[PDB]
Design a binder for this molecule. Structure first.
Ligand SMILES: *Cc1c(COP(=O)(O)O)cnc(C)c1O
Ligand SMILES: *Cc1c(COP(=O)(O)O)cnc(C)c1O
Lengths: 125, 388, 388, 125
């Protein structure tokens, strides 16, 4: 019942891995949402003075949940702090063509990126 | 080869060719298409004779008197008939029923309905290995306990309950004892002339017969009585009304005659594969066997993998046709065993069969190793586990 | 030719070849043998798709929404489900049920059981022609009447009740209306989008489908609700649990698709034969037509011969495969019509079908003339009648 | 479920017909037994001074009931008044190999012959 893009991202996830949580260049946010009991850790490292250099993720959930956070890391690369700040789950769901049921994967994906950003801003200090 | 690999024999089995070609002779105008109920001409008689043959074929496989064989539409109806019929019959003696939390839905949902009808049901929790503790079963028994239903082989994990020992306990206290033997017929040996079982349910499509046909053993001595749930002519000795589906019945009878022969060797072959399969994956870091390798059905193997999500696992095993602990609800079986929702979610039920090969078992073994290590690479939980 | 001549299509019909060869493709390991319930792989999906096709094929024949189609094991179960489910659901509004004394056993025996469960059933007597007087039906209706069940075509005499008119009466007083349409499906035209029928039962083997499979129409708008009688997973929208017999369902769906096409011409052909048959025997001194030549099913003809004993008649018609008003009990239908036990005993139910020919109708016509005049020569009652 | 002899007698009944009820040579007895609602009329004409000349029957019931009374007329020919008097249903049932259910056909057959005899004796006067 999955979409083609989701299959692609699930079977070939882009940006798997993790960054040093004390990298100073890195803001990491790990958000889960027990309600289906998933959890995805996303984190960025920013090109000092705004723009985003690179991001990485790890996740635990459906292929949808996975493809969701995969897509996000891909989208975030080359973006700004704020450009990525205004991503909105809805856009993530449209792209992946998510069914009503797996809508929670977007909300979560958005939560993750927003949480990582907030972490970066908090550390400076 | 041939993908995807069918490892879901517990959901259903492919009708053996011999079973099918026998069915064909009881359908068209030139075959034996008559109605057994028509007791006034050749057509009804010839159909009637074929019915008897099958009724006996089924009886011989389980060591019962063919008269004790009541035809139904499947194991679901059998389970319903058994537990409902007896409960409504022997209700004056008592209204308390005992059963296992891990019973197939056909049994549980029946008891839920009965509860709302005024009866009292005690759902027993099994040990972590799925086996029921007989001491607990006994403690649960009261003077007003009238019926106990414990299945032979479990459909999710394939654990085998000592139905023989339970039968004694029941007979001893004069409690009707029902056994959902749908997963065990033609696999594990059954002899109702030895067994103290009062009521037993079988279907056909689990042992390579056609779907939509089953049977219900109702003991003749000592006589067990039940109230019919299907009215309209009082057929099957007034226990199950409705036209007897000849071609369907022939199918069953034939699949049972075949079972009686090939069951011996076949079941020990499956045991070798199942073992082979578990061999190839038991070394994977955090995998969990659900059931009892020793005392469990030779054709069913249900395992839980930790730190990977249920659905992502199923997706990874695109190449296999299996079943899982998913449905907005994890497997109630695996949760009655004492597995948390996550471990329960991420469970695969491998069920082997007639067509399974060592070749395929090997492919699966590697496929599972591949997938788990890969999904664990994506798992952030795996990392936290990996380091403190 | 070919003796004996099969004139018992009302008992059962031979599975049309097209129906059968379609069934074969959903059984063996190389066919589509999967379980529709398996929602996690190709096998379950392909089976699932075939099920839908059939569900629609059946729906299109009766002008219903496929969702309103509930699968059962046959018309008996359907009848049970329909009348039991609704009665237990709408019991708070009332506990009174109305029905015809001439209803098939599956209905009557169900009501007998319900009566002993606390419900109140009114069995209506039909006119000498079998037709139900609607004025009487209406008089029987009370504020606490919750369900009415009147069958379309009668299985013994083939009389046709105005189910349309009855539907209006019921809907008008807000009474659930069930119709046992098993003998009429694929023969007489049915459109549930016009008809005010709330519940309808069909089987397959009466219209050249496989035995052991049926359906139950449960109206969606205005929503009719029933309590499931078969529990275990809440399948068929929670109305009928149990694995869906794919090959059986395909069979039905296919037999219904065929019916939709050939029903028009075929039914008018049968009407010609039935007429031909009655033509050839209506001149026999004291023969009695049971039903309504005008307003009766085109394929059923039930006649009573006076002054000859029931069994001796059946024996004389060795060459035919028919049915009779015998069973330690004459036909309750024919006795509810106002026939005495003797006339009821000595009744023959000729039921025509797909394979019936003018050639055979002629043979029967002569055979019946021969037998009756011969048995009357042995009859001492005939003599007393013949002379004062 | 019928026996061969029964089929024979049913399909080819021996001695169908009736005698003049005032034949003076004839004793006729018509007995039925509502209980299954059958009825058979048997009657004889006796060779004055004991022996039986000829008999005839008509009946209404199963093929068994028919074959039963058929057999009886056949047996009675060439018999005596008393020889035929001691026929006994059991013997009729054994001959025709009647199943428990159709046992009533014997009892009835015997009733019939015995009733016909009694009628003859009564008229003389
Ligand atoms: C599949 C299954 C059933 C259902 O019986 P059908 O014949 O498929 O309706 C019941 N009990 C068990 C243990 C089963 O595995
Ligand atoms: C034959 C018949 C039935 C029985 O239904 P099955 O599908 O044979 O169980 C019910 N109602 C009528 C009117 C019938 O003729």
């Amino acid at each position: 019942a999955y979409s083609e893009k989701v299959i692609d991202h699930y079977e070939n996830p882009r940006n798997v891995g993790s960054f040093d949580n004390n990298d100073e260049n890195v803001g990491s946010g790990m958000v889960g949402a027990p309600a289906c009991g998933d959890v995805m850790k996303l984190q960025i490292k920013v090109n000092d003075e705004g723009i985003i250099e690179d991001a990485r993720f790890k996740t635990y959930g459906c292929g949808s949940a996975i493809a969701s956070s995969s897509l996000v890391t891909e989208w975030v690369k080359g973006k700004s702090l704020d450009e990525a700040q205004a991503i909105k789950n809805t856009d993530i769901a449209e792209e992946l063509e998510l069914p009503p049921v797996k809508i929670h994967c977007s909300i979560l994906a958005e939560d993750a990126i927003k949480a990582a950003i907030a972490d970066y801003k908090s550390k400076r200090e | 080869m041939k993908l995807p690999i069918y490892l879901d024999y517990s959901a259903t089995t492919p009708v053996d060719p011999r079973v099918a070609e026998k069915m064909m002779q009881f359908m068209t105008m030139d075959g034996t298409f008559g109605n057994p109920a028509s007791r006034s001409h050749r057509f009804g008689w010839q159909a009637e004779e074929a019915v008897d043959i099958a009724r006996n074929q089924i009886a011989d496989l389980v060591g019962a008197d063919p008269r004790e064989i009541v035809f139904t539409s499947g194991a679901t109806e059998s389970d319903n008939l058994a537990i409902k019929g007896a409960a409504n019959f022997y209700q004056k003696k008592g209204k308390h029923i005992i059963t296992s939390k891990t019973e197939h839905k056909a049994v549980l949902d029946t008891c839920r309905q009965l509860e709302r009808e005024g009866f009292e049901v005690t759902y027993l929790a099994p040990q972590r290995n799925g086996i029921i503790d007989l001491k607990e079963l006994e403690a649960a028994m009261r003077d007003d306990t009238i019926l106990v239903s414990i299945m032979h082989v479990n459909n999710e994990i394939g654990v085998v309950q000592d139905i023989a020992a339970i039968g004694e306990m029941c007979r001893a206290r004069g409690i009707i004892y029902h056994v959902d033997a749908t997963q065990s017929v033609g696999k594990l040996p059954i002899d109702l002339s030895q067994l103290k079982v009062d009521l037993m349910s079988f279907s056909g499509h689990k042992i390579y017969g056609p779907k939509g046909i089953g049977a219900l053993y109702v003991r003749r001595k000592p006589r067990v009585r039940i109230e019919a749930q299907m009215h309209g002519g009082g057929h099957e000795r007034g226990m199950r009304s409705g036209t007897l589906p000849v071609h369907q019945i022939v199918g069953m009878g034939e699949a049972y005659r075949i079972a009686k022969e090939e069951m011996a060797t076949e079941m020990e072959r499956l045991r070798g594969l199942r073992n082979r399969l578990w061999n190839g994956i038991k070394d994977i870091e955090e995998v969990y066997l659900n059931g009892d390798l020793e005392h469990g059905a030779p054709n069913i193997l249900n395992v839980s993998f930790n730190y990977v999500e249920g659905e992502s696992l199923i997706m990874a095993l695109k190449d296999l046709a299996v079943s899982s602990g998913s449905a907005l609800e994890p497997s109630y079986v695996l949760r009655a065993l004492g597995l948390n929702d996550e471990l329960a979610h991420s469970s695969i039920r491998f069920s082997l069969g007639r067509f399974t090969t060592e070749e395929e078992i090997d492919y699966t073994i590697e496929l599972v190793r591949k997938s788990i290590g890969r999904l664990r690479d994506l798992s952030p939980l795996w990392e936290m586990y990996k380091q403190g």
